Amino acid sequence: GFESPRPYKLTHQVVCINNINFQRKSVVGFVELTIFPTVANLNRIKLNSKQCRIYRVRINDLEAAFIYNDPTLEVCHSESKQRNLNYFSNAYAAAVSAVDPDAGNGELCIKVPSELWKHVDELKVLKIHINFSLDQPKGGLHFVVPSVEGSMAERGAHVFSCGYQNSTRFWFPCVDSYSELCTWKLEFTVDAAMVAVSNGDLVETVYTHDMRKKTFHYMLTIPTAASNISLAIGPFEILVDPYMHEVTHFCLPQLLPLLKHTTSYLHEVFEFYEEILTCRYPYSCFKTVFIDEAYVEVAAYASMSIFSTNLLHSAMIIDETPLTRRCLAQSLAQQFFGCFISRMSWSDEWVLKGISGYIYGLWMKKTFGVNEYRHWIKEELDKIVAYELKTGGVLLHPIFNPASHLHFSIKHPHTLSWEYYSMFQCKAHLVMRLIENRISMEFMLQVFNKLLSLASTASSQKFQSHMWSQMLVSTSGFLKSISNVSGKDIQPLIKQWVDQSGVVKFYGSFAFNRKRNVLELEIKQDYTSPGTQKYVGPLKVTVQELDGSFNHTLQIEENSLKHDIPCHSKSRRNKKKKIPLMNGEEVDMDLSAMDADSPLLWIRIDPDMSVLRKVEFEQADFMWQYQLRYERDVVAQQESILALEKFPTPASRLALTDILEQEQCFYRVRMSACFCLAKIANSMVSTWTGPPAMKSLFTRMFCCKSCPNIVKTNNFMSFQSYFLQKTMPVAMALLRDVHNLCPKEVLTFILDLIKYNDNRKNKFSDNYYRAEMIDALANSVTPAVSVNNEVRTLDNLNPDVRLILEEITRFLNMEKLLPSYRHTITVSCLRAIRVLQKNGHVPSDPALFKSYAEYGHFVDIRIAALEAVVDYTKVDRSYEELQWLLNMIQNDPVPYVRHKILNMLTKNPPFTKNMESPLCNEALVDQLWKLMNSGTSHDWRLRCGAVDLYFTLFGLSRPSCLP
Amino acid sequence: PWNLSNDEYYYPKIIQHSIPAVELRQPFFPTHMGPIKLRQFHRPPLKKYSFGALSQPGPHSVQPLLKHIKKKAKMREQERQASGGGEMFFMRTPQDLTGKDGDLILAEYSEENGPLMMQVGMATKIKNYYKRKPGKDPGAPDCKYGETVYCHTSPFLGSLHPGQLLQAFENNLFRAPIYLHKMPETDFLIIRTRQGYYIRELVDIFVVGQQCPLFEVPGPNSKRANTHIRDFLQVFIYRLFWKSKDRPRRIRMEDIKKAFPSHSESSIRKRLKLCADFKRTGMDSNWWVLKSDFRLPTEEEIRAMVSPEQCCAYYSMIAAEQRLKDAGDDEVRTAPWNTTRAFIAAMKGKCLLEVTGVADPTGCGEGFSYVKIPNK
Amino acid sequence: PHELESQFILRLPPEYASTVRRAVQSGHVNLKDRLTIELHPDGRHGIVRVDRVPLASKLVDLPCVMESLKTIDKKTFYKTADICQMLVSTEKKFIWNHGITLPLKNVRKRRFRKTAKKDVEKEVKRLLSTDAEAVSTRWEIIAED
């Protein structure tokens, strides 16, 4: 049951936009809402509006009086001397709650005229006509106007609606909540050479009487929220999908072949999401818009998605096809379960984010294989356990503070830190995988189909919400639908992993009792760490003995420590028979390293990742080597690679080398075995016999049979030896000698890989392989032996580093004339120049990176150069570079770059709270408090980034370096 | 840009009982069966009521139940269409397992005493195995009940002919070929309860052939047998602690002695040795209160302790124990622990079975005998 | 507590079976007055009264074991009761040799193994009870006497 927090119900909204002026960056328009009051004596009506100048408001064609105030413009007063962050977080939460449409509130308060009170008490319709104007919007709708001359279509100027969550208040007045569903009528009067893309279906396109402008009329009969309404106006090249004909793809001019190749896969994503769920795609059209200077890499609205143009690749670009493919896939998953089925509160957001991430993981499983699915699930789980042990924990479904261990309030999406938002979505889809583990996948897809079917029977009624709230899901409704389809309720699992905000830590060690033939496990939990919680459920453990692989369920109550499980025979060591594996197959194992008295080959605690856990198991090194070689699970091979770094014995070198030589191993395991072999080789110097590690293996796999030092000409058509070939010198460059300097046998090998590179014969590009070669050249740089702080000049350069510097100069200059796909070699060469500057080789001068961080460059070059400037101002304690970065945060045209500068200055801070630095003035405290209070008031993501930066630099209490 | 997961080298290649059945509730799964109740195993006599409407002697009207059947079916269809229209789970209460509603079929058994047999409340599926004809085939002859599956590899001991559809009961306990027959024209089904008689007609009756056992019945005094007895007693003790209303969770010993009266001293109270403590002083006196540090297991853990098929295998073992005991080595071979071990070993390919022998439940040439012969 | 329901089969004469079938498929409570069942304290004798016309009944034991199986989807079937008795209307006499289906007729004589059925042990209990009163016991081989 859904009861509105608003005293009115909104039925229909007309959004008309005229006069989109690109020179002056200005729109004019009106908005006409059709509300039905649910309570009599409605009097004031409270709507949401930011940055719009409200000209006049007429209610039922009668002139009404409005008052506007935004408390989130300046959160705390300018003349308050408070400088602690808990004060700002409480004031910011109160300010966002005072404009919240999820309460009754709002920023624009319109007073109902007196003569309509007899029209409002007996509950009859009210039609509110606001007309407004955006004069020059800061972060409302992004105007990308290039400075080439010509007409606005000839130079490539466009507008798009940017922002996250409820940010539609930034460009027209609305009820900007996900729970106020209404039908829509959208008119946009644009230039005759431009096209206006929006939500709904385009009913017509009429000309103006001078035929210089045309009006696009859109209609949206599926009741969506105001937060799902978008807009993209530009000189877009239109491409109808040749497979599905209601899907149109819009790109920027001159990028039509890239659009044709890139969006050619999307019909398979549509077919997948419509056959695992049994509902068809709910909207009547689908539109993909590719734009410049995007807010996020992929945004999903109702019947529309806005991607950045940096996803567009051609047919000869690999290492970008899977990333763009999965961006399209998660946009479509959010089309199904973020835009059609919406949220009922700010709680129950974990339901939608979990269903979107879970069905996108099912797509990844079918498309890229179960092994890529397991690797992705393991990397997300490692991400969450790192974040939750780092700071507190992520709390899905809080109850309204519920989480007081962090520095922000979790009551609203616009007060969350961006890393918390990312980890929120990550934990939501892993908890949905856990619900699939308890209640099987076909019942899970039946739950999702039952939600979609209720929403689509709701979506066709005309009753103003008498049934349109069946399109809003809640937690209680989701659990009730689960209990309807399965008969089991998941309330212990919901109580543990949703309502409780923690992950578990397992420390395991075993001992084999030879007398009674048992395996005595010893599993203890660390439940006193700040991020942890105590697990009391069951726990699966998989033991591989000589007779095969056996699963055991252990009951781990609070007082439990020793778990005795039984062991089988050892009669497959009497006769040589094959040892049967986890799957149905069996292999020949070399049992010379195994103990004579124990049959068990390896043990895995929680193999299926059925809890949110971090396992620290103490096996013997031969058990880790057997688990690396003969396991049929990629997460166990990865964890054995990760645990073999502590055992540098030559049997582990043989294990990793046998993994590296082995095709029919998953390629991301071999790419990890490269770096593990490099670390082991560095640890057993003065024992290593022959050549450096992986060199003979590289010449055996990727070089000519007649010439060992000449590499084969590039043929990248295998896509697994391409990835292994481009990752093996990067790990080979980490080889450390007795003197701690990279050997001149590996550096010469990398330089010969660079010289003899011929790419005139493959059908794929070479930009990522050459960029990884520059990364391998950067890995070999050891710190220089400066004497008496000698100035680093050209004559006293290292003889090794002169070759590296010549190569990166040649590569960067050739990129200036023949550019790569996304300036990958510019990014790699800037990163390598920063590596050479971090050691004492090149003079520590930020002027090159400051010239590459200007506005007109590509955004990857910009963020690489700004990362180099952030690293410089951390190491050299530069005041003027920090003022340069803070000025670039305040006034840069691209808001993604501002968010990225705040993100990089949070990750690599110039000082922490413990450090005494010269940069801890009262002036810097006043600048960052002014940046939290004012200055970042227009983005909701820069303000949370400024809160994160103030927390990283000065902590939760009063800045110490202050009177 | 492709698969790139070497999956052929790493990975080279269902029955939902009612909630009274998976929770092992007393009426349906008895804790103790005496000798006269083991002789009448799966043949329950018509008991005389002491109190009720049928306990008073005299003529009693039977009551038709066709408004009840169609009202319950319409109500269940409303429940299914309100829940999104998919397939639903309905058997959540003991009152769902009555014969007064739903489409009843009857199932007759060919053998007198099968090696395994379902308790009341357990589910089974009907699978129609259909071997296609060589080359072109019209399609499976359609059947009113069950789902069709195309079996290249015969599930049973023999192999299906081309174009032959064979229906079968399939569950976790056994798999057995069933043959649909129409009912006699004279027979009706009277459901008597304490309140009165009720009458249904039947139209479909299956004849169940010789079972192919999928679960191994344990032997008497086996390790699996004693483990099942101990786990059943522990599950009953946990469910008595869950049913207790007074916190600190307290039970009485003679409730357990009423449920398991053949259990001696140590045995019945070795499960009360842990989890419980005998309060006899002041309050809670002569009660076994639950220990304050002991976390009582949740419902899914108690369900994971004992399975209903293990209870059916134990009931088959103790019923066969009684029949053998009453009848004073040929009979011992026909005991279900021997025959189930023989058939499951034959299905892994360990050994072969003499298909003509004395374990033959027919007593003539029809039917198989599941006793082990060497493959040599 | 829960008591397992006790289902049995009622066999009627064919004209009376047709009237009872028509009244069951009609579904009114008029059938309730028309059809009654009186079971005598013998336990194996009764009257079934169809339309107030008395018929003589015997409760007999069936040679096979039947099981009622209910379903909701016609794919999974749940066992509800065991049927072993039939109240045919018109000891050794209370045992039925034939089965209900057409292929099963005199299943007891031909399609059943003759290991045994049951009687001998109740007589043993009675004999031990009588033995209890003994001081001098005499037992012999015995021949053709």
Coordinates of N, CA, C and O in Angstrom, one line a residue, chain A residues 867-906:
Chain A
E867 N 45.8 13.9 -12.8 CA 46.3 12.9 -11.9 C 47.8 13.2 -11.6 O 48.2 13.1 -10.5
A868 N 48.5 13.5 -12.7 CA 49.9 13.9 -12.5 C 50.1 15.1 -11.7 O 51.0 15.2 -10.8
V869 N 49.2 16.1 -11.9 CA 49.3 17.4 -11.1 C 49.0 17.1 -9.6 O 49.6 17.7 -8.7
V870 N 48.0 16.3 -9.4 CA 47.6 15.9 -8.0 C 48.8 15.2 -7.3 O 49.1 15.4 -6.1
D871 N 49.4 14.3 -8.0 CA 50.6 13.6 -7.4 C 51.7 14.5 -7.2 O 52.4 14.4 -6.2
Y872 N 51.9 15.5 -8.1 CA 53.0 16.5 -7.9 C 52.7 17.3 -6.7 O 53.6 17.6 -5.8
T873 N 51.5 17.8 -6.5 CA 51.2 18.7 -5.4 C 51.1 17.9 -4.1 O 51.1 18.5 -3.0
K874 N 51.0 16.6 -4.1 CA 51.2 15.8 -2.9 C 52.6 15.7 -2.6 O 53.0 15.9 -1.4
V875 N 53.5 15.4 -3.5 CA 54.9 15.1 -3.2 C 55.7 16.4 -3.0 O 56.5 16.4 -2.1
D876 N 55.4 17.5 -3.8 CA 56.2 18.7 -3.7 C 55.6 19.7 -2.8 O 56.1 20.8 -2.7
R877 N 54.4 19.4 -2.1 CA 53.8 20.3 -1.2 C 53.6 21.7 -1.8 O 53.9 22.7 -1.2
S878 N 53.1 21.7 -3.1 CA 53.0 23.0 -3.8 C 51.7 23.7 -3.4 O 50.7 23.1 -3.5
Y879 N 51.8 24.9 -3.0 CA 50.6 25.7 -2.7 C 49.9 26.2 -3.9 O 48.7 26.1 -4.0
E880 N 50.7 26.7 -4.9 CA 50.1 27.3 -6.1 C 49.5 26.2 -7.0 O 48.5 26.5 -7.6
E881 N 50.0 25.0 -6.9 CA 49.3 23.9 -7.7 C 48.0 23.5 -7.0 O 47.1 23.1 -7.7
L882 N 48.0 23.5 -5.7 CA 46.7 23.2 -5.0 C 45.7 24.3 -5.3 O 44.5 24.0 -5.4
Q883 N 46.1 25.6 -5.3 CA 45.2 26.6 -5.7 C 44.7 26.6 -7.1 O 43.6 26.9 -7.4
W884 N 45.6 26.1 -8.0 CA 45.3 25.8 -9.4 C 44.2 24.7 -9.5 O 43.2 24.9 -10.2
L885 N 44.4 23.7 -8.7 CA 43.4 22.6 -8.7 C 42.0 23.0 -8.1 O 41.0 22.6 -8.7
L886 N 42.1 23.8 -7.1 CA 40.8 24.2 -6.5 C 40.1 25.2 -7.4 O 38.9 25.2 -7.4
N887 N 40.8 26.1 -8.1 CA 40.3 27.0 -9.1 C 39.7 26.2 -10.2 O 38.6 26.5 -10.7
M888 N 40.3 25.1 -10.6 CA 39.8 24.3 -11.7 C 38.5 23.5 -11.2 O 37.7 23.2 -12.1
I889 N 38.5 23.2 -10.0 CA 37.2 22.6 -9.4 C 36.1 23.6 -9.5 O 35.0 23.3 -9.8
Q890 N 36.4 24.9 -9.2 CA 35.3 25.9 -9.1 C 34.8 26.3 -10.5 O 33.6 26.3 -10.7
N891 N 35.7 26.6 -11.5 CA 35.2 27.0 -12.8 C 35.9 26.2 -13.9 O 36.9 26.6 -14.5
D892 N 35.4 25.0 -14.2 CA 35.7 24.2 -15.4 C 34.4 24.0 -16.2 O 33.4 23.8 -15.5
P893 N 34.5 23.9 -17.5 CA 33.2 23.7 -18.2 C 32.6 22.3 -18.1 O 31.4 22.1 -18.0
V894 N 33.5 21.3 -18.0 CA 33.0 19.9 -17.9 C 32.9 19.6 -16.4 O 33.8 19.6 -15.7
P895 N 31.6 19.2 -16.0 CA 31.5 18.8 -14.6 C 32.0 17.5 -14.2 O 32.3 17.3 -13.0
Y896 N 32.1 16.6 -15.2 CA 32.8 15.3 -14.9 C 34.2 15.5 -14.5 O 34.8 14.7 -13.7
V897 N 34.9 16.5 -15.1 CA 36.3 16.7 -14.8 C 36.4 17.3 -13.4 O 37.3 17.0 -12.7
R898 N 35.5 18.2 -13.0 CA 35.5 18.7 -11.6 C 35.3 17.6 -10.6 O 36.0 17.6 -9.6
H899 N 34.3 16.7 -10.9 CA 34.1 15.5 -10.0 C 35.3 14.6 -9.9 O 35.7 14.1 -8.9
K900 N 36.0 14.5 -11.1 CA 37.2 13.6 -11.1 C 38.4 14.3 -10.4 O 39.2 13.6 -9.8
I901 N 38.5 15.6 -10.4 CA 39.6 16.3 -9.7 C 39.3 16.2 -8.2 O 40.3 15.9 -7.4
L902 N 38.1 16.3 -7.7 CA 37.8 16.1 -6.3 C 38.0 14.7 -5.9 O 38.5 14.4 -4.8
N903 N 37.7 13.7 -6.8 CA 37.9 12.3 -6.5 C 39.4 12.0 -6.4 O 39.8 11.3 -5.5
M904 N 40.2 12.5 -7.3 CA 41.6 12.2 -7.2 C 42.3 12.9 -6.1 O 43.3 12.4 -5.5
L905 N 41.8 14.1 -5.7 CA 42.4 14.8 -4.6 C 41.9 14.2 -3.2 O 42.5 14.5 -2.2
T906 N 40.8 13.4 -3.3 CA 40.4 12.6 -2.1 C 41.2 11.3 -2.0 O 41.7 10.9 -0.9

